[PDB]
Amino acid sequence: GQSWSLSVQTLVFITSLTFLPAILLMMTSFTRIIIVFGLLRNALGTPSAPPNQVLLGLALFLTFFIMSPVIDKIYVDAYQPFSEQKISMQEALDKGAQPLRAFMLRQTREADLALFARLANSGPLQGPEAVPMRILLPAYVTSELKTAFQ
Amino acid sequence: DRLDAALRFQQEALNLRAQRQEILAANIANADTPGYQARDIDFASELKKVMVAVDLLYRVPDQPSLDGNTVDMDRERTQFADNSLKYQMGLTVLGSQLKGMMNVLQ
Amino acid sequence: DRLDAALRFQQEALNLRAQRQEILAANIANADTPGYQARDIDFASELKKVMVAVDLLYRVPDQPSLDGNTVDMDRERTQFADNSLKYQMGLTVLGSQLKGMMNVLQ
C-alpha cells in the first residue's frame, strides 16, 4: 500500500529512540535480574558491597546474552524488508512486535491474564489469541516481580 | 537510499535544466555561423527517462536564410528566460525541502 | 595536524584563487600601458605543485597592437568573473566544512 514520507519517518524514529530506555528494558527484558541482584546484595549483609555500576553492567550483559536469539529474530524480521524498502511501517511495527509478544506470553501467567481480562472486559475465549497490549504488559510485569521475589 | 530517493527527482530536474541552459547558450552564441543548426532537448522525455549521454534534436526552422543559419533570437531569448526561471524554482524547492529535512532533527 | 591538512587543501585553493585575482586586477589596471605583457598562472598545476615561489606565464595574444600592449579585455574580464565565482565557491565550501566540524562538538 501507501506510506508516509522520510521526514515523518525520521521524526517517529527519533521519538521511538527517545522512548527506548524504559519501554524495551524496564518492562520487557530484565527487571527481574536487577531485583534478584539487589536481594543477593542485601542478603550478603553489606550495603553496596559491589558497585551499582558493575551490577548494572553485569545485568545488561546477561540480558543481551539471554535475549540475543530473540533480538536477532526481531532484527531480521524488521530490517530485512525495511532496509531494502519492501514493506511499510504500518505493518512493520506489527511484524516486529509479534515475536516479542509471543516470547513474553510464555513468561506471563494465566491468572494475571484472566484478572486483567476481567478488569478490561475483554473476550476470554477457550483458546488464547493475540492478547491486547493493555493486558499483556501488566501481567508480564507482575509475573516478573513475583518470580523475582521468589 | 531513502534520503537519495527523496531528492533524486529535484536534483535530476536541476541538472537537466542546467544542461538545457548550456545548450541554449551555445546556440545563441553561434547565431552568426552559417550552416549551424539550432539545438535543444525534449525536457519532459529526458527527465522521465533519467528518473526511470544526453539526447538532443534539431529545432524546426522559423524563417529561411541564404547563409544557412536557423536560429531565431526572440524564440531563444524566451526559452532562455523560461528555463532560467524554472531552474530558480527548482533550486528554491530543493532548498526548502532540505531545510525541512534539517529542521525535523530538532 | 590532520585538521591542518584537511582544511589545508581548501585553504591553499583559496590562497591561489586570491593570487590569481590579484594578477587579473593588475593586468586590468595596466590595460593601457604600452609595452605591457599579459600575465597569468596555471591554477591546476600550481595547486598540484603547492600541495606536493609562484611562477607566472605570458598570456597568448589574440590581436596585434602597435603600442605593444597585448592584454586583451574581454577574455580577461571573463577570467575575472570566473575566478571571483570560484573563489566564492571555495569560500563557502570551506565555511560549510568548518561549520560541520564545529557543530559536532556541541
Added chain:
Amino acid sequence: ALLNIFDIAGSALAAQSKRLNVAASNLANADSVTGPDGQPYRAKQVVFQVDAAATGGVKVASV
C-alpha cells in the same frame, strides 16, 4: 556543466570583437591606394567555426 557557459560567452565576445575590428579596418582602408610592399589593399574578413570539443561556442578559424 555550468562553468562552460563562461567559456562559450567569452568565445562569442572575442569572435564578435574580431569581426568588429575587421569591419573597422575595412572602413578605414576603404580608399588605400597601396600598402607597404606595393600591392594594392584587399578587403579582409573572418571565417567562423563551431568550437565543439556536440556543440559549444563560436571560434574564428582565420582571416
Added chain:
Amino acid sequence: ALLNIFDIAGSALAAQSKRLNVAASNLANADSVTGPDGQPYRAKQVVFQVDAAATGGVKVASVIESQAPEKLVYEPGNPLADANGYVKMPNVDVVGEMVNTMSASRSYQANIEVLNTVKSMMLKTLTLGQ
C-alpha cells in the same frame, strides 16, 4: 499556468518579426522585375490568427499574394513584353509598407515591455517559497 504568458509574448514577437520581414522584402523588391523563370514579381502579405487553445497567442498560417492588379508599363524593347508590348511591374504601396513597419515596431516594443514587467513579477514570486 502563469507561464503561458511567455509563450504568448514569444509568439507575438515572432509574428511581428515575420510581418516586418515581409514588409522589408516588399520594399526591397519595389521596382524589381523578371524574377526566376521570368514570372513577374508579386507582393505578399501575412494574415494573423489567434490560437484557440478562449485566449491564446498569435500565429501566421501562410503568406498570401496580393490580388491587386500589377502595373502594366508599355515597353516593347523588353522580351517580357506581350503582344501589346507591356511589362508587368509589381504592385508595392510604399506608404502602406512604411505604416506596416511602424506598427510592427510599436507592437514589438509593447510586447517586450510586457515581458519585462512579467519577468520582474515572476522573479519576485519565488521569494515566498522559502
Added chain:
Amino acid sequence: ALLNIFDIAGSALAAQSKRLNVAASNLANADSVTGPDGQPYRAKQVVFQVDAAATGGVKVASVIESQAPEKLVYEPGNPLADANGYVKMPNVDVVGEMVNTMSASRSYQANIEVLNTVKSMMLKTLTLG
C-alpha cells in the same frame, strides 16, 4: 485561525494572474484579424466577484467580450472585406491594457508580501513557547 489568509491570498493571486493573462492576450492580438472560422477577434475582460462563504477573497466569475464599438478599416483588396469593403478590427485600447497590466503586477506583489507577512507571524506563533 489566521490560516484562511492563505486561501484568501491564493484566490487573489489566481484572479490577478488571470486578469494579467487576459490583458496580455489582448495586447498580443490587438492587430489580429479573422480568427478561426472567420469570426473577428473581440476584446475580452474579466469580472471579479467576492467568494463569500460575510467577507472573503476575490474569484473570477467568467470572461465577457467588451461591448465597445468594433473598428473598421476600408480595404476592398482583401477577401475578408464585407459588402462595403470593410475589414473588422478588434476594439483594443493599448493604454488601457498597459494600465491593467501594471495594476495587476502591483496587486500581485502586494498580495505575495501579505502572504510572507502572515507566514512570518504564524511561524512566530509556532515558536511562542
Added chain:
Amino acid sequence: QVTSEQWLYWLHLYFWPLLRVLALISTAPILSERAIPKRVKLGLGIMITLVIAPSLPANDTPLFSIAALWLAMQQILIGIALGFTM
C-alpha cells in the same frame, strides 16, 4: 486537519487515578521494597496506566489550588488506609 483533542480535559481524566494507585505502592513497601529499583518503582505507576489511564467511569472537573488540595488530601487516605492494613 489542524485540530485539538482538548488536552486539558484529558489531563484530569486520563491521569487522575494515577495518584491513588501510586500512593498505595508507596504505602506498601513490604510488597515492594527498596530492593526493587527506584526506577522501576517510578514505572510502577505508568505500567498500570495502560489499563487505568483510558476511559474510566470516575471523572470530574479540573483541579487547581483549592480543588486540588482537598481532593489530593482525601484521595491519599484511601491509598494510606489500604497499604497499612495489609
Added chain:
Amino acid sequence: GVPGALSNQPAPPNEAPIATP
C-alpha cells in the same frame, strides 16, 4: 510542422538561385 517545435531531422539546406537551372 509548426515553427519553433522539436524535430528529429534537419531541414534541407537553403539556396537562392539567381536563374533557374
Added chain:
Amino acid sequence: GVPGALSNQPAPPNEAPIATP
C-alpha cells in the same frame, strides 16, 4: 596556439613599417 591560452615565453614585438626596406 589558440588565442587566450597560456604559453611559457612572451609574444614578439609588434611593428608597423611604413615602407618595407
Added chain:
Amino acid sequence: AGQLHAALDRISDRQAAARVQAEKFTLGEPGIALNDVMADMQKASVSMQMGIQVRNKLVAAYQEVMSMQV
C-alpha cells in the same frame, strides 16, 4: 491514543501531495499556475512545523512525568 498517529499520517499525506503537485508542475505539463504549488508548499511546511512542535511538547511532558520520585 492513535489520534496522534492519524494526525501525523494526515500531515504526511498533505506534504506528500504537495511534493507530487510540485513534481507534476516540473514535468512541464499545464495543470498548475505556479501559485497553487507555492501555497501548498507553504501550508505543508507550516503543518510539519506544527507537528514537530507538538512532538517536542509531548516528549517534554513525558520526560517530566517520568522524572517523578515516588
Added chain:
Amino acid sequence: IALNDVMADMQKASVSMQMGIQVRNKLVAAYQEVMSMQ
C-alpha cells in the same frame, strides 16, 4: 478551530501537568520522610 487557541490549550495542559506533578512529588516526599523518621 484556531492555531493560537490550540497553542494556548497545549500551554494550559503543560502548566497544569507541571502543577500536579510538583504537588504530588512534594506530598510523597513528605510522606516518605515521615515514614523514614521514627
Added chain:
Amino acid sequence: SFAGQLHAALDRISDRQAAARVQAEKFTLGEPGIALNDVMADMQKASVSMQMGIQVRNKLVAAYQEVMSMQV
C-alpha cells in the same frame, strides 16, 4: 548484531562524506564533467546525514546515562 550495525552506519556516513570531498576536490581542479549544483547538493546531503548521526548519538548516550545512573 549491534556493534556491527553501528560500524556499518559509521562506514556509510564516512563514505558519503569522502565521496562529497573527492567530488569537490575534482571540481576545484578543473576536471570537466562535474556540476556545481551537483556537488553542492551532495555536500548538503552529507551534512544532513552527519546531523542525523550526531542526533542519534546524543539520544543514545543520553539514554545510556539515564539507564546506568540509577541505583539498584
